[PDB]
Amino acid sequence: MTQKEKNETCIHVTVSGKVQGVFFRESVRKKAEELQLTGWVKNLSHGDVELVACGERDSIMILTEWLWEGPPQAAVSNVNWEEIVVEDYSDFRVR
Ligand SMILES: [Cl-]
Numbered sequence: 001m002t003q004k005e006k007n008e009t010c011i012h013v014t015v016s017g018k019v020q021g022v023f024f025r026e027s028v029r030k031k032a033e034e035l036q037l038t039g040w041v042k043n044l045s046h047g048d049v050e051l052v053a054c055g056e057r058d059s060i061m062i063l064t065e066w067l068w069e070g071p072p073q074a075a076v077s078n079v080n081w082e083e084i085v086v087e088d089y090s091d092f093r094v095r
Pocket of ligand 1: 029092093094
């Protein structure tokens with residue numbers, strides 16, 4: 001494997017709770033960028049926040065812990081993640 005291939009993976013996450021009207025999408029993108037992760041995030045209508053995050057595993061695991069807190073005024077009730085088949089992204093975007 002290349003070093004990037006060896007040292008990186010991807011996860012898929014859903015985040016439940018009070019996650020609307022608190023700029024959750026933007027906060028995930030900003031946090032991900034600070035952790036040098038790529039992927040995407042959206043707010044499912046009437047539902048959970050959903051994201052894919054790819055990059056180094058330490059960063060991934062810092063993100064998954066942070067998702068229990070979220071941005072100010074967020075009230076997260078659950079974070080459900082799994083590692084997935086790797087997908088290629090050049091940046092982290094809101095969707
Ligand atoms: Cl974006």
